[PDB]
Structure formats: C-alpha cells, structure tokens
Amino acid sequence: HARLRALNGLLYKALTDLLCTPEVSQELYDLNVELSKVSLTACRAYWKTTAEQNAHMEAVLQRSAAHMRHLLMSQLRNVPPIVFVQDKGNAALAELDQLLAVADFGPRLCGIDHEALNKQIMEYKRRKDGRKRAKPRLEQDSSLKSYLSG
Amino acid sequence: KNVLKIRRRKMNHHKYRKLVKKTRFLRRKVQEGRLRRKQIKFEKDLRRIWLKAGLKEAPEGWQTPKIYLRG
Amino acid sequence: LHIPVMVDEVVHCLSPQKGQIFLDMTFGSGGHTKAILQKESDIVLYALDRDPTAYALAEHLSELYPKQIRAMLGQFSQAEALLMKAGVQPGTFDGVLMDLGCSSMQLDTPERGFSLRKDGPLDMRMDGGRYPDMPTAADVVNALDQQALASILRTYGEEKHAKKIASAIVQARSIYPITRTQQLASIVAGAFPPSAIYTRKDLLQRSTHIATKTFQALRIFVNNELNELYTGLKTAQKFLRPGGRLVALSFHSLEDRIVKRFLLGISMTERFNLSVRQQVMKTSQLGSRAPLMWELIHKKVLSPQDQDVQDNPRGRSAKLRAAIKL
RNA sequence: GAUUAACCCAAGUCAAUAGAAGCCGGCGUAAAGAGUGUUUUAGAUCACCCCCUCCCCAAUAAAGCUAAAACUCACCUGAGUUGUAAAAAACUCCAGUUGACACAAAAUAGACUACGAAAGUGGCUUUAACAUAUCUGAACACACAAUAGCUAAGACCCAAACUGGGAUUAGAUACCCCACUAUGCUUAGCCCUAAACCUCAACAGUUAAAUCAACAAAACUGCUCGCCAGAACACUACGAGCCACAGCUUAAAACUCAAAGGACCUGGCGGUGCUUCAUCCCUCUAGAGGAGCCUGUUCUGUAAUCGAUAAACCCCGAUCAACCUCACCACCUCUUGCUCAGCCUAUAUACCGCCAUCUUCAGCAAACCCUGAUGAAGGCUACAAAGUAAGCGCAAGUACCCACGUAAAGACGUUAGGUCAAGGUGUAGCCCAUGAGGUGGCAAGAAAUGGGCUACAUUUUCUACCCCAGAAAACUACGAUAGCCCUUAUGAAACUUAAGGGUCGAAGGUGGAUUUAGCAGUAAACUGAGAGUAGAGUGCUUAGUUGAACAGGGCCCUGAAGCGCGUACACACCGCCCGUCACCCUCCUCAAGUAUACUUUAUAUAGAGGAGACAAGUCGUAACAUGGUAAGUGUACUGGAAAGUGCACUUGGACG
Numbered sequence A: 001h002a003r004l005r006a007l008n009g010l011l012y013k014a015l016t017d018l019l020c021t022p023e024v025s026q027e028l029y030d031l032n033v034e035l036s037k038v039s040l041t042a043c044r045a046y047w048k049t050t051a052e053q054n055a056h057m058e059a060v061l062q063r064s065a066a067h068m069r070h071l072l073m074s075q076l077r078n079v080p081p082i083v084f085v086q087d088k089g090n091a092a093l094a095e096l097d098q099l100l101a102v103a104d105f106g107p108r109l110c111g112i113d114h115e116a117l118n119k120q121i122m123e124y125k126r127r128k129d130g131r132k133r134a135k136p137r138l139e140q141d142s143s144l145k146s147y148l149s150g
Numbered sequence B: 001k002n003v004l005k006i007r008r009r010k011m012n013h014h015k016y017r018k019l020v021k022k023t024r025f026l027r028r029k030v031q032e033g034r035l036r037r038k039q040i041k042f043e044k045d046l047r048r049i050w051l052k053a054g055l056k057e058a059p060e061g062w063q064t065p066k067i068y069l070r071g
Numbered sequence C: 001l002h003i004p005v006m007v008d009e010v011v012h013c014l015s016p017q018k019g020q021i022f023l024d025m026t027f028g029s030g031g032h033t034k035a036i037l038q039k040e041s042d043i044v045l046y047a048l049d050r051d052p053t054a055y056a057l058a059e060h061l062s063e064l065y066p067k068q069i070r071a072m073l074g075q076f077s078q079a080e081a082l083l084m085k086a087g088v089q090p091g092t093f094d095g096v097l098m099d100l101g102c103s104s105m106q107l108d109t110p111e112r113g114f115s116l117r118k119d120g121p122l123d124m125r126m127d128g129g130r131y132p133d134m135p136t137a138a139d140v141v142n143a144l145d146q147q148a149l150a151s152i153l154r155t156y157g158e159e160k161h162a163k164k165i166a167s168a169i170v171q172a173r174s175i176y177p178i179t180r181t182q183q184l185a186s187i188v189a190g191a192f193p194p195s196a197i198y199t200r201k202d203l204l205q206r207s208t209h210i211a212t213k214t215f216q217a218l219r220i221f222v223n224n225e226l227n228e229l230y231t232g233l234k235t236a237q238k239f240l241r242p243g244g245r246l247v248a249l250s251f252h253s254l255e256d257r258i259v260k261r262f263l264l265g266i267s268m269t270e271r272f273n274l275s276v277r278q279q280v281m282k283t284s285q286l287g288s289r290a291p292l293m294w295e296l297i298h299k300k301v302l303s304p305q306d307q308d309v310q311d312n313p314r315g316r317s318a319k320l321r322a323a324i325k326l
Numbered sequence D: 001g002a003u004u005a006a007c008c009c010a011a012g013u014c015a016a017u018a019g020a021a022g023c024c025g026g027c028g029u030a031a032a033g034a035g036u037g038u039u040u041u042a043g044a045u046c047a048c049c050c051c052c053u054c055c056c057c058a059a060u061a062a063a064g065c066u067a068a069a070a071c072u073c074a075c076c077u078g079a080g081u082u083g084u085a086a087a088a089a090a091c092u093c094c095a096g097u098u099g100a101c102a103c104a105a106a107a108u109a110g111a112c113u114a115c116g117a118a119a120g121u122g123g124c125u126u127u128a129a130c131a132u133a134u135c136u137g138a139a140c141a142c143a144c145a146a147u148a149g150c151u152a153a154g155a156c157c158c159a160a161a162c163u164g165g166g167a168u169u170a171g172a173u174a175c176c177c178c179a180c181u182a183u184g185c186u187u188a189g190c191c192c193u194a195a196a197c198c199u200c201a202a203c204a205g206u207u208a209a210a211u212c213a214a215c216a217a218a219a220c221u222g223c224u225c226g227c228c229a230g231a232a233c234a235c236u237a238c239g240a241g242c243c244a245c246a247g248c249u250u251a252a253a254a255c256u257c258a259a260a261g262g263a264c265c266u267g268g269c270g271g272u273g274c275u276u277c278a279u280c281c282c283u284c285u286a287g288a289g290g291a292g293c294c295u296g297u298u299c300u301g302u303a304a305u306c307g308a309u310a311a312a313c314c315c316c317g318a319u320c321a322a323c324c325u326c327a328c329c330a331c332c333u334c335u336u337g338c339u340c341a342g343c344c345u346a347u348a349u350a351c352c353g354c355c356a357u358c359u360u361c362a363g364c365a366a367a368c369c370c371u372g373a374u375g376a377a378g379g380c381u382a383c384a385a386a387g388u389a390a391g392c393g394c395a396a397g398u399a400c401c402c403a404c405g406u407a408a409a410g411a412c413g414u415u416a417g418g419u420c421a422a423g424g425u426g427u428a429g430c431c432c433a434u435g436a437g438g439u440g441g442c443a444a445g446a447a448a449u450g451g452g453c454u455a456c457a458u459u460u461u462c463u464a465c466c467c468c469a470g471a472a473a474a475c476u477a478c479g480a481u482a483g484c485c486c487u488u489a490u491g492a493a494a495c496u497u498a499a500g501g502g503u504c505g506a507a508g509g510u511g512g513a514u515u516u517a518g519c520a521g522u523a524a525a526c527u528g529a530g531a532g533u534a535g536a537g538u539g540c541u542u543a544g545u546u547g548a549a550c551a552g553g554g555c556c557c558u559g560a561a562g563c564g565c566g567u568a569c570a571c572a573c574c575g576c577c578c579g580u581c582a583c584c585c586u587c588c589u590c591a592a593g594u595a596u597a598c599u600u601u602a603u604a605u606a607g608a609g610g611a612g613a614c615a616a617g618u619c620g621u622a623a624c625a626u627g628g629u630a631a632g633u634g635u636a637c638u639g640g641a642a643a644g645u646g647c648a649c650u651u652g653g654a655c656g
Ligand SMILES: Nc1ncnc2c1ncn2[C@@H]1O[C@H](CSCC[C@H](N)C(=O)O)[C@@H](O)[C@H]1O
Pocket: C004, C025, C026, C027, C028, C029, C030, C031, C032, C033, C048, C049, C050, C051, C054, C074, C075, C076, C077, C099, C100, C101, C102, C103, C104, C126, C127, C223, C228, C229
C-alpha cells in the first residue's frame, strides 16, 4: 500500500519531468500541461483543465501517449499504459452544459406522529368505554476433587 | 501512556486554587497573625539570650529589627 | 396574584393606540389585556383562548366593555376560521400578543391537574371539556408504548432519562391506571432513588420536583402546543397588518426556538444550539434562505428583572420577542 | 445457623494484641536521575603507559546598521473598504497606484544539525568572547534559568488575555468578526516556574557471554553523587527560607483502601482512515398502501379453548371446526374406569423427536507441528517465507430435460427461537377428579390490522369462435364469489357448508408517504389437476399455455469484506471516568469564653474549614476513539462555578 503510494509518486514525478523537458516533444513542451494526480492500479493521469485549447491539449496528449510510454520504458521500465483524464472540475457539469446548449427546449414538524398517537388514545378510550455477578476468575472447579476422589 | 496521574494532579491543583481564591482574605489575616507571632517569638528568643548572658537589658544601641514584615 | 410577566414591556412594544386592532391569542387571565385597555380605551381587542373559564373571563371583560373587547373560545388552529367569520378576514391586525405556558387560574385549580403540588385527575388539558373526546394526560400515559412515551418525554420534555422514566411509568400503569397527578408524581419519584426527588434545580437554582419536566411534556403533548403554536404564528402572520407589532413570550426552550426560527425564517428542521464551528463545518460539507419578512423590535430577547423573579418565580424563564411584520 | 461426619492440636485449644526476621534492591514508561554549571570537606582509579579535536557554522554581551512587509503622511484616481459559513458591526481622509517612512519582527539559505552548562540561540558589521592537561562533587553555598507575571520609565507597526460591540445560540459564555488594554519590545530591578523531555545522571570501559520481563532507545560493567521504599490524603497542612503576600522551595500525619500502577495481548467500540463490494440507492415490470369481499390476527362481547405472535406470527399448527373433530363452557352422570388406570395439568428456561434464522454463508472441530527465550498469543506470501495428513460442510456426485438451471443439500455456531396440544419423556401436581361419558352451546362487530380474490373497463364487456366477427360502451355502462329469496348436493341434522337460479347493480373511477416480488420460459396473465372431507377454502400443492421490460449508474444512507490506526471500555460506548450537589459517621486543621502565663503571647476546649466514607443518584459531558473543539505542562486574566482564552513548551496526537 505504502509501496504503491511511493510508486504513484514516482510515476507522477517522472511524468512531470517528461512534460517539463522540451526533448520529449515541442508540442508537449509548448502546451505546458500540469498534472493534478497520478494513480496506478494501468495508470490514470489527471491534468488540470483550462474549451478549444482544452480540446487541443487533450488531442495532443492522446497523440503523444504512446511516445510518452515508450520514453517511460527507458527509465520503472515496466510501466503500464498511461490514461490521461481531463479534469474539467466536475466533468459532468461541462458535458451537461454542452448538451444543454445542443439540446432543444422548443417554444418558450413536531417530530412525532401525533395523529397515530391520537388514534391510539381514542382506541384506548373506546376500549375502556441489579443483582450480584460473580467474577469469572473466582468460579469453583470440582474436577480436581473428582480426580482425587477416584 | 495515559495521563491519569497527571489528570489527578491537575484536578487537585484546580481545587486548591479554587479554595485559595474562596478564602484568600482569611488566609491573609492568618498569615499576618503568624508573622506577628514569628516576630514576637524571635524577640523573646533574643531576650532570653541576653538575659541568660546576665545583661540586665539589651546591649546599648541594639533594637531588634522587624525581619518578618514586608515594609 | 401572578402579575403578567413584563407586561410593561409588552405594552411598550405593542404601543396600543385608539382605533387599532389587537389580537391576544392567549387571553387567559387577561392581565396583559387589562393593561392594554388601561393604555387605550378605544382599542378594538380580541381575546382568544381555549379555556372555557378564560372565555368566561373574556365575557366578563365584555360586560365591562361591550364591544371594545371581543371574546373568542377556540384553539389556534380554529382561530383562522373563527376570525375569518368574526369580521377580520382581510387581517390587517395592528398588533398581536402571544403568551405561552399555563394560566394562573389553570395552574391553581387542582381539578385541571396542571400541578403536581395539588392532587387531581391526570388531565393536563387546557380545554375545560369543550371537546370531551380530546385526550387527557391519563389516557396518554396509560395508552402510549414504551418507545412512544420515551420519545414524547425526550423531545417535548427535554428529559435525559426518557428510556428509564417511560419504562417506570409503563410498569406502574400495568398494575393500576394512572389517574391521579400525585400518583404520577410518586411513580416518577420511584423511577429514581428518593434522594433524587428534589436534586434537579430550576434555572433559579431552586429545588423543584423531579417529575416537573415530565409533567410539562405531557401538557404539551396533550395540547399539541408546538404544532398549534406554529399554526397560530402562521395565522397571525397571514392576518397581521404590514408594519404591525407582534410580541411573544416564551417560557421554555422549545417554544422560544419555534418563535425565533419563525421570526428569522430559519428552517425548523435545522439542528438546535448551533455553534459557529458547527455552521462552518456544515457549510464546508455543503460547499462541495427565504427572503426576510420581519423587522425585530428587539434583536436580543428581554428577560424579567431579579425583583420580578422574586415576585413571580414562575415567570423567570420567560423570554420576550418583539417584531414587526415586513 | 443447626445437625451428621471429618480434620488439626490436646489438658488444652486459639480469638485479640505484641514481638520474632530486614533494603549489597532499584530510578526511560511502574515510587525514584531532581532545569543547568562550578567548587568545598572529601571520594574514586577512569590521573602515569594512554593518543585526536584551534579548523566551518544559529553561544553570549555591547554599539551601529536595514532588505522585505506594516503603520503613518502626501499626490492622483476611485466610491466604497474591511469582514464571514452567511452576515452584521466597524471604517468611509476609506481603498488602489507612486513616494517618503521603525526602539517591531528577522523569508529563501536550513533537505544544514552547528554554538552554549542548561534555558536557549537562524538579518548584517565590528569589538570583547566560548572555564579546567584526572574524574565525581550541593532543593539550601556561588552563578544562571523559556514562557507567563510583578515594579518603574519609555516605545507601540503588528499580535493580543481582559473589556465593549456584532453575529451564532432557547439563552449566557465560548468557538466567528471588529475595535481596544494589560502583555509580547527597550532600560533597571524582581519573580525562579514547565511535558525545563534525548521523560536516557556524570566519568571510564566493553561488544564477549545469558542479547533481553514488555515497550521505549542494543545489552552491560566499573566508579561517584542525587533520589525512591503500596495507593490516596499531598505540586497539601504545619515549620523554615525567599524582594516572593491568591507565591515558590523543602514537605508530613491522622482517618480510609487491598489494591494503586507499568508494558502488552485478545475482544468490543471509534461523530475511525483507506480500498472494494451488495440488490443498500437509482434504473425495469407487476403489485400492496384507496374500494368490496374471502381469510387470519388483535380488541370488544360471551358461560365459552390452546399454541404461534420483529425479521424467523398473522389462509400459522389446519393437507381445513355445523354434530364429531374438541382439547372450551353450562348442566347431568361414572369411579379399578379401553389400558397391570388415567390427565390436552405446570415446566420448550429439563429434553428427545421435527424445524425456523443467519444460510441468497464456507467455514468448523478434533489430532499434530512450528514461532514468540516454551508470556497472553501467533502460524500468510504460488517465481511461496510453517503449517498439516484425516473428519464434517461447501464442492463433487445424484434427481428433473444437458455439462446449464431448478431442486435437494447446507457443517459448527447464533436467537434458553418454536413445539410438554404429534408422540415419547425428566421433574412437579391431580386420583369422588386437573380423570371418564352424555346432551346442549359459542363462532357477534362499534372496530383496527395482515394476506388474498374481484375490480375500478376500451389492450374493455357480451356472444360466436378459440384469435380476419357482430354488438355493448356511464345512470338500463363497467363493477359482488356481498345481501335477500328459492332450489339442489352432502348429511341423521344446512338461514349455518357448497353449488345453481332469481333478485339487487352497491362501494369504487388506478389509490400518500411507504412497501412486496422478480433477472427468462422468469415476472405478468390464463387454464387444469391433486392432497384433504360425508360435504366444505378466494387456501395449499402441482402440471401446462401465452410471455415480456431493465439489465446500467453509485457509496450519501444501509450492510458486508479486507488492510490499517486508536482504545483509561471488558456488564465491553445505553461503556467508563471526571467535576457538581443543604444531611448523618471517622480524621485533621482551627478562631471563641474562661483557668495558668507576660500586657500580648504562651497555655488547657470550641465556631468554622479540609480529607474520607455514606442514600446515592441528580447535573455538566471535561477525559478515554482525531472522545465529537488533539491532549497536556507552566503562568496570567475573566467566571459564583461547569470552564474559556493569551504566551511559550511537550508528543505522552494525526497528516498531502
Ligand atoms: N392553542 C391554543 N389556543 C387557544 N388558547 C391557548 C392555546 N394554547 C394555550 N392557550 C391558552 O393560553 C393561555 C396561556 S397562559 C395565559 C396567560 C395570560 N395571557 C395572562 O393573563 O397571564 C391559557 O389560557 C391557555 O389555555
């Protein structure tokens, strides 16, 4: 568990170093993508999202994922495939807003059940009209008496 | 480890401070009386010393200082 | 004579004047009503109450003032229709006064069974028999289950030992019906060691009977004081003139909480005695109200003086809230 | 307690009291290394052999200096600024930019581990300066000693007890906001405390034995000083000392208890962390919850059973009550009775027998083996590291139509689960009756509730047909298996049961929270048969026909599993513990009035406080879980108190 945590941290550091250096790719270096999270199970990568530029960043990352995995294999050589997850805050909100723009709208007390208790009282009206606990360690045993008896 | 001994000491100290606060005036009066008795006993001891020595009175130019007073 | 508590401040906050409509939903003895009539004689006042004796006192005041004061017998829930038929359907009430608790004539009378000091039937019913089908506290204690009675004492009575007192009451009732107030007091006393009879002390730090809270709980549950009070507040707000003065007196924590949350528009389901740290934690969890309708005459509650406490110890816990409809 | 018996001693026995015997043991967490250094009288041999610590850091004191930031001021511009969970209050010569501008505090370096005796010390420069060529050596001598605090005089950006205001609260206080004071700073004195903790005394030596209670931090030896001798009373009382005056240091005893305590293990628990799950939620279909009726339970009533009765009772024992059944009730009768009697009398909390429940589980219990020093306990890694040959269960096999599915199976264990009314049986009770027999009788609804049936129709109703039809379709519709009446079947007995016909056409108009069931030939709908009865169910069992929709998304709730963490609980958190509370007991301290005393004090009792116990719980929920706001030491202020807050310190808390 802690070993997997350290492995996740190492993967995060390696991916950040690959992102920062220009030797990996001029496109990736120009993007200046920053990673929010890296977690290994396959590997899930989560990068902070800035729409058009976000789509371009996602497309470039998807294109360069294979090269990134190949470069990671040079280092940690047995690296599982890396999955990039775009963190649009709550992605559900972004997708929902996109669909909503796309979509069509057409033309424009007391804390008790007082009633139940009242019913029960009316029903009633109608029908009318400690000790010592011995310690476990002090309990006697007569097995030895029986053994000595015969 | 647990702090049961520390907690007992803390409760004892809290109770003692509360008691002191409740009766600080009576304690102050008792302490003043004790200081008076202390000074009186010290003076009596010095008087006994010079009486056993045979001097009929204290030595010339000697006055017992109030060594037990704040002033 | 239990003088109306802080009646001077009630008069000040209401500020009675000639030709104004003032509704007293808790006429009762009428000391507040008498003081208001003393300040203004031409005021048109409504004296609503559930006790038939209170209605009789209101009719006596009507004998004193034929139409300046208008009597009304009924609960807060009925008060809406009663006033609608009375001739104040458009509302426009210039003032509203709402006391709470037990009337002095109610508490003194042992037949009503409002006090453990004097024996009597375990009635604890503000109604004096206008609706005989209305449950009495004796029927409540004899009928309700252990869990039901425990919940009633825990919520209404603010009782810590509901799980114990309810079981003791059930055990006693299984032997004999609980038909006497003093019998119930003895039963509750037996639920604890005898030394604990007067260990509980009032807010005045004065010894009271241990069963008192229990008694209080039953009273509320007999009269549905919380729900009927909420309905009365809603009906008053519906019938109160814009800019009218609403003055309320609350003798315990639950009714004061209800009144304050109604005035400030707070959700009734919100937790009680919230601290700033608890609010911050709640908002942090919720971080991933209705528009105000009142203007408080007094931001802070008004409490009786120490001398008034000595004169009327029963009114010590009274807290006064004054607001104006917006 | 009596009695029998036995045991020990014995002209004694043994109840009380007293005595007999004494510290070569220890000090991280159990009592105990005291905040620090030095030395004296001395002690030790670690002083000779015998060796190395100037170097480079944040020791200390003084003087001077200032980079970032703040405050203030000024110009310009803006009308708002600040503030919160949301606000209010506050400010509005307020804010932003620029410029000038400190007796305050010392980012980064510092991931360094240095200096100093300890406390402490992290901006720059300069001066002065970091004892001892053997160690040990003090509550008190000598000299220091964080923070808080006191006295006096200054400074005052900021922070800030206290106070005021605003919120929040049922409300006060606190947590939050704002303003502001003591205070943090300087000078000179004082106070002398800490979780002053590396909780490890100083010096010297060793790594060989037995390494070693445990944990912490590998185990020890030599030597010296200090300290401890059950818990609590008690960081207290008295005495003494002190610049201290609600103070600090030293520090008891009486009453009381049989424990208090340290470490660890297992479990329970955590308003415990993480991870992954299921029908837990959403999604699908048809229902229940509204109506009538059937039936069951409950309640009432009656002379009138019993049992089940949260899931795991409620068309349940019953696969079935008009008489019988029947165990109920009333009345009458019998006494070796159908029985080498009898009892459906008590006890399912004595049991067998047969089952429910988790179980829509996969584990259980023996017999060994191994680890921990042979402590409680523990025993898994598949490229395997102490577990295992057998038994039980799952599994496998088998039944039905397959290998799938459904049945069946389903251990141990859980609920003293159900049944003494299937039968048997322990114990207890009845014997002219609690046994046996006969006649007659309940069985009603003012109701509530569970399940089921039929419906509220147009995917319907009626007829034909068994799927190419014709009519009906809202007051002559749909809708009773209900009521009333009359036949018939069975029976000795039928307004009781059932079937049929006639009559009546009622309530109802797809029904709220909530709730049941289903994953495929399933749900849904329709039809037949059987068990049982003389007859009798809308019940049960079973065969068959028609025959779908969703099968995804989640852990907030519920529950489960795994890896963890904590644990003062073990009656296992509805736990425990702490503080609080007029009144009797025991003990200590203690002022009065009067005898002695030299006029105060001494000196002989007696108001009042304190400690413990008592009926004990009430009250607060502070502590133990991240114990609900991490806990605690010191100190200060506020509060009647429960406590709250400020400053520094500690981990005896956690963490990206
Ligand atoms: N729901 C309700 N409707 C009507 N009257 C009510 C009520 N709840 C309480 N009351 C009445 O209100 C009064 C409360 S105490 C009466 C106080 C009175 N104002 C005086 O003069 O002191 C009683 O009369 C009580 O019976």
